[PDB]
Design a protein around this ligand. Sequence first.
Ligand SMILES: [Ca+2]
Ligand SMILES: [Ca+2]
Ligand SMILES: [Ca+2]
Ligand SMILES: [Ca+2]
Ligand SMILES: [Ca+2]
Ligand SMILES: [Ca+2]
Ligand SMILES: [Ca+2]
Ligand SMILES: [Ca+2]
Lengths: 169, 169, 170, 171, 171, 170, 171, 170, 170, 169, 169, 171
Amino acid sequence: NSQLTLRALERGDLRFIHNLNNNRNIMSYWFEEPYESFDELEELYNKHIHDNAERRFVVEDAQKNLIGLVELIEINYIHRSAEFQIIIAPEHQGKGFARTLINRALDYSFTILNLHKIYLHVAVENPKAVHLYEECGFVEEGHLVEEFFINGRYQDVKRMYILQSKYLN
Amino acid sequence: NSQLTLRALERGDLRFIHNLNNNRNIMSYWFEEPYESFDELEELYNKHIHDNAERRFVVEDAQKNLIGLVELIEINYIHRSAEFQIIIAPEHQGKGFARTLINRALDYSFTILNLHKIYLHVAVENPKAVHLYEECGFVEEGHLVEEFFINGRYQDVKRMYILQSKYLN
Amino acid sequence: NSQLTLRALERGDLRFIHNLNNNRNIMSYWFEEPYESFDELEELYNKHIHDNAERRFVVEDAQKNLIGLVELIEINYIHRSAEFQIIIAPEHQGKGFARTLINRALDYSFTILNLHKIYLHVAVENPKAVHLYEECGFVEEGHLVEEFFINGRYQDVKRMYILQSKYLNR
Amino acid sequence: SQLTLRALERGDLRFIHNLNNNRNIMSYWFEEPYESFDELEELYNKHIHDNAERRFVVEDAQKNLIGLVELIEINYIHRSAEFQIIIAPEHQGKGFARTLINRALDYSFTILNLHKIYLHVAVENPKAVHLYEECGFVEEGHLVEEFFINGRYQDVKRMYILQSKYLNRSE
Amino acid sequence: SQLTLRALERGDLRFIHNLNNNRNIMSYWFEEPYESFDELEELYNKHIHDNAERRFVVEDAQKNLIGLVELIEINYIHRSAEFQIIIAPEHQGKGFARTLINRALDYSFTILNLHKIYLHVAVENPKAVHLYEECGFVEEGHLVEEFFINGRYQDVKRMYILQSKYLNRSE
Amino acid sequence: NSQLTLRALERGDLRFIHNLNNNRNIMSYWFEEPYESFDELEELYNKHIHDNAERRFVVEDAQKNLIGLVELIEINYIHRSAEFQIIIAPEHQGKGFARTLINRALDYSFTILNLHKIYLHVAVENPKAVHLYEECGFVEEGHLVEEFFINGRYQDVKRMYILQSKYLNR
Amino acid sequence: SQLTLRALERGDLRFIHNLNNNRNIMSYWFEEPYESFDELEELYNKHIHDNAERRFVVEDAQKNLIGLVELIEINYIHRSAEFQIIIAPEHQGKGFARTLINRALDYSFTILNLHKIYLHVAVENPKAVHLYEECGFVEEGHLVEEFFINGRYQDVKRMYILQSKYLNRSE
Amino acid sequence: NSQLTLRALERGDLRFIHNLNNNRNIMSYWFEEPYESFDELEELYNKHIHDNAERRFVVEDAQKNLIGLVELIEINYIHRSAEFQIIIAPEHQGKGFARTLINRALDYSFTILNLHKIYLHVAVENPKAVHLYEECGFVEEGHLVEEFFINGRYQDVKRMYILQSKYLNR
Amino acid sequence: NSQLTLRALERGDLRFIHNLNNNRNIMSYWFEEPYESFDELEELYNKHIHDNAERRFVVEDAQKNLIGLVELIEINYIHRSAEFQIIIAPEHQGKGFARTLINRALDYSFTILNLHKIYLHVAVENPKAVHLYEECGFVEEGHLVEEFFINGRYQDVKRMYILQSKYLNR
Amino acid sequence: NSQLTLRALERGDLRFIHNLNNNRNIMSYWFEEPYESFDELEELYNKHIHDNAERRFVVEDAQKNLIGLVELIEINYIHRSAEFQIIIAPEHQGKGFARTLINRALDYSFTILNLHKIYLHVAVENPKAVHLYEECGFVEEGHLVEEFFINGRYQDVKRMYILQSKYLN
Amino acid sequence: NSQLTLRALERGDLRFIHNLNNNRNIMSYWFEEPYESFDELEELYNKHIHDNAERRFVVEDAQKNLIGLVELIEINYIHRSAEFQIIIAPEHQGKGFARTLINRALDYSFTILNLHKIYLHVAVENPKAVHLYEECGFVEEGHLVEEFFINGRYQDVKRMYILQSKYLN
Amino acid sequence: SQLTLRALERGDLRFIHNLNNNRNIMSYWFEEPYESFDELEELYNKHIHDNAERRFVVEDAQKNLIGLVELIEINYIHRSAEFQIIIAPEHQGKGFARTLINRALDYSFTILNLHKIYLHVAVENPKAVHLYEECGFVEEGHLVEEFFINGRYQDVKRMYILQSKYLNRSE
Ligand SMILES: [Ca+2]
Ligand SMILES: [Ca+2]
Ligand SMILES: [Ca+2]
Ligand SMILES: [Ca+2]
Ligand SMILES: [Ca+2]
Ligand SMILES: [Ca+2]
Ligand SMILES: [Ca+2]
Ligand SMILES: [Ca+2]
């Protein structure tokens, strides 16, 4: 909660990323390229190394156990917005780490990158996640209908946002 | 209204595209690269010629006057969704062409590309456009707060959608 | 047709090809890449110029009017098979060129390329085309269910074939 | 439940190549014929970002390699693909086939969101034809002299199944 | 209103090069010094997709080329850039400068959404310093022997203006 | 062997190939490029890895001793022909592997690759080899005069062939 | 004497392609099959420095294009090549063939210094076989079902002639 | 320290550089490209190896402990100026190395590179650093307003300079 | 000059440059590569377009007649020195342009490029040229023995220099 | 004889070179690559433009008629030697130009390039050429046996040389 | 003498080649590029691996001691000629191996490569080498004057040749 | 005799770089300034086939690295080059300099066949000037404020020697 730190994703963390994907078992993307294998992930990482439109970070504890991933995509440097997500590894879920990770992502987004707005998508069928985000200051701005094909059907997601002025002021 | 046809954007239409951009006077993008000049537009067109994540079309009348542009971006072939917009050239605005263009874009999206969902953004301060889209069967799914910096301030947009099942059935 | 001739597609014929696509108004492919514009067609033609897995030909009359296109795709040089299609330009449809063009494509396929089998797909909802192909010696070997998304719905197609031995013994 | 599906990786190419020499017919990678491990490896590297074919390896709980699930000719507008499954000789006849087929359909219809999957089966392997029918595939073609296999042209059934049948048949 | 700003294009490079030979100091494109039209042209092509510098040409109603608006050192995290304006000798002293400066600020603050714009002006050109002050720029530095210009090191004022001042000063 | 098996040539077999060349001591070729060294062989293998006009295979016994090489070159996928050759390692010559290797090459050529014709060249001055090939079903179709410069003089070779239809009906 | 041989150039490719569509069999350039002028042109550019095949055009005094002389499979150790000649339909039967053949042998044996030239002729064209025999070629093979031509496998004679015969037969 | 030495940055020092970045926890740049990861740092080092517009050096003690980094950027070879910065590793801060490192950077700048002017930026809200630089001979030439977004707000920096003639005459 | 102007060499001036070379009839160099033909000159111009180690300028009169060439080579941006030469077109030799051109080159070198020193080589056997340079403020600093092979023998050259401080204080 | 000048071969002179080759009707080489066609000549010229191992020059009269070619090959800058030849166009043969061309080649070789030795090959069956070279100061240093296959047989050539010290002193 | 075999030069033999060069202490060439270092030799070997204009071979004894080098350069496949040399390592000189090496080079040249003529250069100041070559059937065809700068002065070489018809018949 | 000269190789670059940090002035490779081992290594690879500069390392009988012999600005028409020698600090003052200089002249004049070698020496190092004079070099220039070294512009002697003097002085 204090002992959780954020650091830039590196090539040796791609195994972790790929293990997070196998566990979630939906289609993953790197700069909009779908991938399933570690090999393609590795190559996409190398190919987009200088692209600033997406940024990834790993959260570790004091003993360097890998806790989760913080990802910003669709980063636009004129409108100053990005989409984010966090993924916590299954073994570390439900330990109360989520809030800390979310705060670390906002801190980076609003005190380093100088973004104006961050938004995220949450499955309407995960009301507890929606609630958590609301408790961290995110507000619903959309209920996107049949937005994503997940587990054999089109599902709705809340689009939730928070502004730099709310987070900092 | 019958005499308006849609055709694939070609290299000779980039002048038209660039004239549409100067008139609207906000930042334009090609596969997420911002551009201002015809030269950069031309080079981006050549570079992304085989990329299927965005598709553009020009609407012409019977005498080949250029009426406007139909653009799909963020095309995802797993979720089967895209973002669209239409831009009508200033001299052809207010002639009642908008509805026809919108129908041509939906027709392409849902009878050729086989998309599931199309969505678009409309400035909350253009309620007449919002109404028009509603009349063509689009439904509001989001009111995105301070989404875009336009004319010196952050503005809200409606996110409006329509599904293939509604359009076809 | 007697003076319909077949010739190898060239770069100056791509305009014709692209006009054939706009008229039929379904998604077209070049070596499996979908394309909509002349520019992308041109670039794909240049990129695949040395690829032998698809071969295209243009049919002209004695005054060099462009009648249509003969296309072989999915050419496999071990099993000696290919998929064929034809597109006749709108203005030349229904004039009785189709059978002649089909025979020219079979002739090339079976007397020059030395293929064993040619097959084609025809919309089940175009029974008169199916009949025509049957009259040219093709036989139904499948009725592919919801095979293609065409004009806003999944459509069935007949798969029809003919063998080299049948064509060469007629 | 014991059997899991995972994306093919470069270290699995040996397995793939061993499966090919056992079956002893001409193999293809993105339509290029190959016979050697070295050419397989090169084709794997060259087409790594191509989404028109996707391959997966099925392993048991101890990571024995059971077989291969392959989708080719994937078209994202018609939303169709051709599938096949190859089980390693030592694992044939243990009743793994139906589980592998279900894993391939699940991926095809719940992740890739395809509409139709089809496959080819030798008309001279009626037991395979039957198996596929039991997994919900239906014959849509009997292709005549389609493939030169073992010194003669052979017929294959073309069999298919639709997303709506796989996902909603029980509703 | 007569004066419009448009993105620099390849056909404007002649104009740019003529502006350089008139001013007769060393010119740069993405930090590469150049003296010839040919090198200018090559640098234009090479950096076409670089967003760290942006250039615009100002024309009148009859498309006479009036001048150049240039942003360099554009940083999209700090949201700052360096600006300059060059008016063609024949159009100097016609009162175009303030209009051009407003067009550059408008683009910088209403389209690019930058936070801060700054510029350098020769301390030995007090009338230019005054002009910039009248357009709302404020001195934040007097850089000592910053640039070797015409055979000696000269001082420049660094002047700035913020987005909030430009957009909201009248509110 | 009965347990002679054929497998696709791989990069780790190039040493064997190069040892076969030094032993025969004539100029060797890879896709028509002459080579003498292991290094050039290796580079040519890498360069032509995707070329289907030549195919090579190594024959091994049950304990993976390397017996020889089967090579198809000049493969033409329209006329459906190829030139074949065999090289048996010196230590395995005269043990009665040759006929088995020849049958394995024909089997691959006619049951997998679906070729129509295989032909080979044999030195006219090695009449016992010519006889062997005749006993395996090859027939002389030419006696090529001063065809190859080999060991300091131009030598004649028989060109011998066999057809798919003959092999598959035996 | 009227007829001269000159190296094929890029402007002659149209002629070459017209010769191919007239003969209506599959043509090759460095073993790549081609059917179109565009692919011919690309193959010409790609193999420009390859010495394994050499082509020449025969013209009359007014630069009418008479035909093509082609050497392929040129091997500079065995000192052999395969030859063919194609005369344009309008110039066939004018008695040019023997002159062209002599020009090809002259080049092959007095400039390239080859040892052996051979050619293939359809066994069903006995008059061509005779012509070649009259120019000093000798049958060394009757290749059985060598080429699929016009819907069936056909036999060809392989005919040859040696440098020593061509140069010294009269000595 | 007397035995603090300056040496050219090498690829094996990038780990140190990256550890210095994580500790300071602001956005770092290499030839104007922002980077956060070791991997991107490494790639930018390789890409700009021949670029002379920035030069970097590592300061070590007699036992080769890494003390800090000296960086010159925006080097202009006509006006003969550069921007300098220093980063001292956390464990070596406050030990009285800073002034020695500054003098080593000035020495290199003015006795080897032959620059005319060096300038640097210091946070206005770190007045003790400003004072230190003044004691080393730097003079304030600007107070740049809201120059940098650092830790969630725009901050002012002093721009401080010193000339070759001053340093070489001290 | 009074209306002699200096402008950056461009690609359309290479013909002039090449005509200057044929007239002087010694081996010419571009970034140390010897060249004799227009074509090689053109290719070297394209290849070194971004190289700052040599800079060239053309001198024109008011009607744009081409008078000559000013060349700086071996430009070193640390020691701040360069080698200069001038070539006047034959038809404009002896008209009293030389001194004006020399002053234009020095002006550029010392007021724009901010160099410290310019030096040049002059044939010892052209004492009137040596004198001219001395009158323009250059001083002999060496007499290089058998420095250059020119017209069939090794020739001596004076090396002459002038410093920025001298030029800017005149 | 005074009015004949030497200039560096250029791309527009390749037609002339190729016409000289068709007339001589033996195998020609460019940096050891055999060529027969103008197209291959052109490409070899472009490819070896920066190679200093061979140098070519054209001799023209006052009206820019092309008289012939001066070629140096096998140029070695350590031993300071090269092989030369001259070819005069058929229409200009026998006008007494040969001597002038030879002197221009020696002048270039020994006063510009600073070579030590130049040598050339002359067919033993062209004794008048051999004599001419001897009159220009070349000396026989070899009678190379069956050196070149020319017109259907191996022929002998004289190798003739001259040194810079002889030419200049 | 029977136990000496010839094999194609490989990359692992470049050390040997480079040691032979340091010992002879004159300028060495690879496809006409001068080189002094092992690194440049290695790179030239890689660059010209497919070039057939020069061919090299190593002579080994039964225990694979490296005896020497056989080199053919200037190989012309129309005239069917090449220049050769042999270099024996200092420790193996004067053991009577020279004759065997020369015969192996001729055998390769005339029974495998099918050349017509081989020639070599021998320093006029090494009359014993000249004699040896004469004993192996080579004949003097030239005495090249001041041909090579060696040890600080220009030296003469005999050019010696032998024909395929002499060697084989 | 103990001291031998050999071509610089990639494994000697560490030595070269150590010689540079000891001398503590700006070093160059084919006119590119460098300070790091990594840039040195890259420049070595990039210019490996460039003959305009040549470097050699001098070793003793036990392969201790003594120093470096460098020729730059090598021009093969004028037949000149610039030379320098750097002896490692630990081997200075052992009397190796003259031997190294003779080895450099020997290579320059007996292998490369150059006409003239010249070098630059600090006018403030009169003992080096003397040494070079004793090895037969003659002053041909006193270059004024030629190099900025240790914070000021310094003069250098330019010294030369000709091939004919080195080879024939004793004749
Ligand atoms: Ca992928
Ligand atoms: Ca841009
Ligand atoms: Ca293959
Ligand atoms: Ca420049
Ligand atoms: Ca082809
Ligand atoms: Ca050639
Ligand atoms: Ca070299
Ligand atoms: Ca550098």
